[PDB]
Amino acid sequence: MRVLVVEDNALLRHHLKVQIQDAGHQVDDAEDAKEADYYLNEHIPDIAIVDLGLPDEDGLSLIRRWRSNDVSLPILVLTARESWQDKVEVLSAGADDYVTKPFHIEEVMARMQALMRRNS
Amino acid sequence: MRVLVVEDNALLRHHLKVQIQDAGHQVDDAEDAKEADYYLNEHIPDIAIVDLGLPDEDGLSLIRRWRSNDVSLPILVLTARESWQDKVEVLSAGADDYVTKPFHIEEVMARMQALMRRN
């Protein structure tokens, strides 16, 4: 499967990509929202991991905009924000799931896997 | 649409049932694993909400047994467990998501909707 990772922190972004690659997937890694639009349009990914703290455009704005254009793939959010209202808001904007920071990387892998399993 | 709630605590079960009804779905509410199997055999729900603290058969076993019998509907687990390793195990069992107890009902409604939306 093809995974799009959108993550502003270079080190995290690279870690994500190599772990997901090592599990047998192809990964596009974008560092901001507009770059995310770049990968989205070039190859439709099967799944996207989106950090909300993008320097470009907030991740919620990004999810909203994709959904409102009938982009329907599963999206797993990475987020600093962790109140229960934040989580309702994120889900309500079109995300399928979220992981709160700080996180272990095996937690994102496990969430991504569960969406992949459902999706396919 | 149709929701199966599996919850050993009568009050939480009753409360869950009416919130979900208030959002406009029909709800089967089961007390333990065997009663869950009863409803599942009656109607395939669009989703099952499964608390793990069942007296019958612990939630995870239930979910593993369902997955192995090709029951593939979305499952949102309710759990008390804390460890980030414990959370990961439940998804490994076949669950799609989980909410920790205590929770706000709005969180559970939002997770159920996210799953019905996608499926």
Swiss-Prot record, chain A:
One MF term in the entry's GO annotations: phosphorelay response regulator activity
Alphabetic keyword roster: Activator, Cytoplasm, DNA-binding, Phosphoprotein, Repressor, Transcription, Transcription regulation, Two-component regulatory system
Induction: The phoP/phoQ operon is positively autoregulated by both PhoP and PhoQ in a Mg(2+)-dependent manner, inhibited at high Mg(2+) concentrations. Induced by dsbA disruption and dithiothreitol.
The name this protein goes by in its record: Transcriptional regulatory protein PhoP
Quaternary structure annotation from Swiss-Prot or TrEMBL: Monomer in the inactive, unphosphorylated state and dimer in the active, phosphorylated state.
Functional note: Member of the two-component regulatory system PhoP/PhoQ involved in adaptation to low Mg(2+) environments and the control of acid resistance genes. In low periplasmic Mg(2+), PhoQ phosphorylates PhoP, resulting in the expression of PhoP-activated genes (PAG) and repression of PhoP-repressed genes (PRG). In high periplasmic Mg(2+), PhoQ dephosphorylates phospho-PhoP, resulting in the repression of PAG and may lead to expression of some PRG. Mediates magnesium influx to the cytosol by activation of MgtA.
Keyword Ribonucleoprotein (UniProt): no
Cellular location(s): Cytoplasm
Source organism (scientific name): Escherichia coli (strain K12)
Domain Response regulatory: 2-116
The record's account of how the chain is modified after translation: Phosphorylated by PhoQ.
In-chain residues carrying the UniProt-annotated modification 4-aspartylphosphate: 51
Additional detail: There is a close linkage between the Rcs and PhoQ/P signaling systems, and both signaling systems respond to certain external divalent cations (zinc and magnesium).
Biological process per Gene Ontology, one example term: regulation of DNA-templated transcription
Regulation: Feedback inhibited by MgrB, which seems to bind PhoQ, altering its activity and that of downstream effector PhoP. PhoP-regulated transcription is redox-sensitive, being activated when the periplasm becomes more reducing (deletion of dsbA/dsbB, or treatment with dithiothreitol). MgrB acts between DsbA/DsbB and PhoP/PhoQ in this pathway.
Chain coiled-coil ranges: none
Boundaries of the shown chain within the full protein: 1 to 120 of 223
Any one GO cellular component localisation term in the record: cytosol
Consequence of gene disruption: Altered expression of 33 genes; 9 are down-regulated, the rest up-regulated.
Swiss-Prot record, chain B:
Inducing factors: The phoP/phoQ operon is positively autoregulated by both PhoP and PhoQ in a Mg(2+)-dependent manner, inhibited at high Mg(2+) concentrations. Induced by dsbA disruption and dithiothreitol.
Source organism, top-level taxon: Bacteria
Keyword hit for DNA-binding: yes
A GO cellular component annotation in the UniProt record: protein-DNA complex
Record note on modification: Phosphorylated by PhoQ.
Localization annotation: Cytoplasm
Protein's UniProt keywords contain Thylakoid: no
Residues recorded with modification 4-aspartylphosphate: 51
Description of the deletion phenotype: Altered expression of 33 genes; 9 are down-regulated, the rest up-regulated.
Function description: Member of the two-component regulatory system PhoP/PhoQ involved in adaptation to low Mg(2+) environments and the control of acid resistance genes. In low periplasmic Mg(2+), PhoQ phosphorylates PhoP, resulting in the expression of PhoP-activated genes (PAG) and repression of PhoP-repressed genes (PRG). In high periplasmic Mg(2+), PhoQ dephosphorylates phospho-PhoP, resulting in the repression of PAG and may lead to expression of some PRG. Mediates magnesium influx to the cytosol by activation of MgtA.
Complex formation: Monomer in the inactive, unphosphorylated state and dimer in the active, phosphorylated state.
Protein name: Transcriptional regulatory protein PhoP
Residues of the full protein shown: 1 to 119 of 223
